[PDB]
Structure 1
Amino acid sequence: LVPRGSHMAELRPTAPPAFASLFPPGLHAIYGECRRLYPDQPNPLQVTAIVKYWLGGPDPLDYVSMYRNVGSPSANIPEHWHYISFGLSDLYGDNRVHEFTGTDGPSGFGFELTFRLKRETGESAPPTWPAELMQGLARYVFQSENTFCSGDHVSWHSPLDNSESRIQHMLLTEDPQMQPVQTPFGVVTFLQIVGVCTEELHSAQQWNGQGILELLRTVPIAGGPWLITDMRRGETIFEIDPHLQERVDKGIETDGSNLSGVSAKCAWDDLSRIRTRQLESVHLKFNQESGALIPLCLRGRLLHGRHFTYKSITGDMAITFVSTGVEGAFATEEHPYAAHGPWLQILLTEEFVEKMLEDLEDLFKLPKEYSWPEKKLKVSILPDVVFDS
């Protein structure tokens, strides 16, 4: 039989913008991607800086395009407003704001901010507050020269739209739609701002940024695969799902912690009986909050050959936990407890911290005391009254 043929049972830019000569080449490329995504909105609402930054203006971003993304409620992606900045990258390439660096490497700071705000009902246009937020974030970047990555966190400690909204902080990720572009003035990637609660910010600091991001992609209400910020969100991802906390802690064990130290209630005392002092025995003290970080300090820092420092909020006192892999420590295996004044350094071997972690479970009859006489070490978790005196 001669082939009858296939019968498919299931099937699912290129033209320059008006008046191209007018556009700066760096602005021209970014706009190209925006058109790719939104051909139906060729003239979107824009917030624009009339007083230019290079002429005294407070606003580093020259433009903020505001499109309407329908999303895919067909696949749990809500309707939202999409915000795209112009100014963080080298737009003009004439050394007015950014140093011209040519095609190789990053255009300006090498990125432009984006943000996806979940659309409410009655909203017949995109709200203009996130534009001002982006301006604010751009000020941070311009005043220093701290270029941001996918995974970075920003401590804002203020409701992003000045609302009562829980969402007071921001994480940064790759925009799910925007593809990095090559301008004549360098390369531009697209960092998306994702709003988060103080609690979730702390989780990213404790673990890593990328991991907390991935966690938000499985919680649509937060959340979603496209990381859309809903300002009217009331509960954290941990309150929506307590099972997630386990994946945070599991990750701290797997990847390690970004947390190098913490200002908390802590103290240490000598049992031996400025210059370095080598202590034969030591007694470390913590409240419930700082004591709760001990497993993180051991499992996610020392077990990874990194270190951890507890600083007492009141006073001179400090404790630094160190592993064998650290360089420049004045605490060695032979003299594992050493202090330069009030600053205590404790060296703990890999074999021994594993044994400690067997004793230390969550982490409540306080004082909760632990003791290893073979190491001459005592760790006690006390009520806050001790350190408040």
Structure 2
Amino acid sequence: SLFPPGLHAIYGECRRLYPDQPNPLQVTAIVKYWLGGPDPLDYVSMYRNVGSPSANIPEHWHYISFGLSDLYGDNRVHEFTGTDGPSGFGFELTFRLKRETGESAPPTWPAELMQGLARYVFQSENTFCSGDHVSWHSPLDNSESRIQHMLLTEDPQMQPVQTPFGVVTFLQIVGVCTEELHSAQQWNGQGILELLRTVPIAGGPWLITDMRRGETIFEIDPHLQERVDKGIETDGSNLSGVSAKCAWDDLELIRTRQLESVHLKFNQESGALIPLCLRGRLLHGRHFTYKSITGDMAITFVSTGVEGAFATEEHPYAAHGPWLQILLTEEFVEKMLEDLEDLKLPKEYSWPEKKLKVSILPDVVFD
């Protein structure tokens, strides 16, 4: 087919929002993914959006991906299901980049950013949800920008589109500072997105990313730090897991292996989230899962009361294949927290009484 039905359906929504831009800049993957190319997004459209500057919606460039959803419906890349359910991964990515004075065209770098995010989705098959975060650890545009990480949210304008191949929603990338990423992790992504909406330079109502932003929302409004602190104290973290570098070693719907001792291994970044796991999750009666990006190992920490776990108070370390579940009691979680003040490799922590070891190791270990 010369015009792909999934593609045409999204274009209808684009036309609705941009009736005066029938011919926007669009980039494309020179060797398409379904022909062996490295980049999963077939196209990225790049629109001018005049916004509503008086309402703290600056003029900006609006990017929309094509490829995460099912464009073609002929099983060249995604599995066809029908009008019901998700089309491909069920969403496309968007991004809103503040226009800098002098710019006559959208910068093309956000297409490369989007390809990176999509490559991860296609390879890991971990999907993105509104409120999720993506740590990145470099200026998104390769400048010296403090904007070095991302939160994900519903696009504030693009409505879900019904296509012959399923429903497609639109998930907007929002650039954030390290401090803001951390706040979303320790509290909740939705809460931080809402704060960004209230600070024009940090996003405003449409969560436009300003790559020239030099200050965090907490530096702009110190009172916001108190709001977040109170939130972490009262609500804990809503983070149920991360895709990360991790492993474990041997030191109900299934029979599981009962482990006498366990050795948990993390890289620097995942290791730094251990206190969140313990204090922000387990002490709130919740669970937290580290899921390997490289392979199939996963470590799910559970607290007493968590339902549907195969780790129990009597047998607290239990595995089904590469999936480890570890039940920690409140008393022991509190002890671990004290011992992990520092949260330089390797770092080793050992609790012989509980037959538990934690190592923080270089990334290569997890290859």
Considering the TM-score relative to the shorter chain, is it more than 0.5? yes
> Aligned equivalents of 1:317 and 1:185: distance in 2?
33
How far apart are 1:283 and its partner, in Å? Answer: 20
How far apart are 1:232 and its partner, in Å? Answer: 0.6
> Aligned equivalents of 2:88 and 2:365: distance in 1?
52
Could you tell me which runs of 5 or more consecutive residues in structure 2 were left unpaired when the two chains were aligned. none
1:238 to 218, 233, 239: 218
**Residues 55, 306 of structure 1: alpha-carbon distance in 2 compared, 3 angstrom cutoff:** same
Superimposed CA distance per residue, residues 80-116 of structure 1 (whole angstroms, 9 cap, x where no aligned partner) = 0000111110001011011111111000010000000
Equivalent residue, structure 1, for 2:154: 174
> Aligned equivalents of 2:351 and 2:255: distance in 1?
27
Larger radius of gyration: 1
Contact residue 274 and residue 341 of structure 1 kept, 8 A:
no
**Residues 234, 356 of structure 1: alpha-carbon distance in 2 compared, 3 angstrom cutoff:** same
How far apart are 1:304 and its partner, in Å? Answer: 2.3
Superimposed CA distance per residue, residues 47-102 of structure 1 (whole angstroms, 9 cap, x where no aligned partner) = 11232111111221111111111111121111100001111100010110111111
**Residues 143, 354 of structure 1: alpha-carbon distance in 2 compared, 3 angstrom cutoff:** closer
How far apart are 1:334 and its partner, in Å? Answer: 12
> Aligned equivalents of 2:363 and 2:33: distance in 1?
49
**Residues 278, 159 of structure 1: alpha-carbon distance in 2 compared, 3 angstrom cutoff:** closer
> Aligned equivalents of 2:245 and 2:86: distance in 1?
43
Alignment of 1:1-389 (within 5 A): 22-258=2-238, 300-306=280-286, 323-326=303-306
SS of the aligned residue for 1:331 comes to coil
Contact residue 240 and residue 288 of structure 2 kept, 8 A:
yes
Instruction: Between 318-327 and 77-86, report the one with greater CA deviation.
Output: 318-327
> Aligned equivalents of 2:346 and 2:77: distance in 1?
59
Instruction: Between 147-156 and 288-297, report the one with greater CA deviation.
Output: 288-297
Instruction: Between 57-66 and 226-235, report the one with greater CA deviation.
Output: 57-66
SS of the aligned residue for 2:200 comes to coil
How far apart are 1:262 and its partner, in Å? Answer: 11
Contact residue 48 and residue 60 of structure 2 kept, 8 A:
yes
Structure number having the greater helix percentage = 2
SS of the aligned residue for 2:341 comes to coil
**Residues 221, 106 of structure 1: alpha-carbon distance in 2 compared, 3 angstrom cutoff:** same
Contact residue 124 and residue 293 of structure 2 kept, 8 A:
no
Which TM-score applies when normalising by structure 2?
Answer: 0.72
SS of the aligned residue for 2:233 comes to helix
How far apart are 1:238 and its partner, in Å? Answer: 1.3
Give the number of aligned pairs. Answer: 367
SS of the aligned residue for 2:102 comes to coil
How far apart are 1:141 and its partner, in Å? Answer: 1.1
Instruction: Between 33-42 and 250-259, report the one with greater CA deviation.
Output: 250-259
> Aligned equivalents of 1:319 and 1:181: distance in 2?
37
Instruction: Between 157-166 and 330-339, report the one with greater CA deviation.
Output: 330-339
Runs of 4+ in structure 1 over 6 Å off: 260-299, 308-322, 327-363, 365-388
Superimposed CA distance per residue, residues 260-304 of structure 1 (whole angstroms, 9 cap, x where no aligned partner) = 799999999999999999999999999999999999677643452
Superimposed CA distance per residue, residues 336-362 of structure 1 (whole angstroms, 9 cap, x where no aligned partner) = 999999999999988999999999999
How much identity, in percent, do the aligned residues show?
A: 99
**Residues 269, 247 of structure 1: alpha-carbon distance in 2 compared, 3 angstrom cutoff:** farther
**Residues 162, 324 of structure 1: alpha-carbon distance in 2 compared, 3 angstrom cutoff:** same
> Aligned equivalents of 1:207 and 1:310: distance in 2?
17
Instruction: Between 332-341 and 129-138, report the one with greater CA deviation.
Output: 332-341
**Residues 43, 342 of structure 1: alpha-carbon distance in 2 compared, 3 angstrom cutoff:** closer
Instruction: Between 105-114 and 199-208, report the one with greater CA deviation.
Output: 199-208
How far apart are 1:184 and its partner, in Å? Answer: 0.2
Contact residue 93 and residue 173 of structure 2 kept, 8 A:
yes
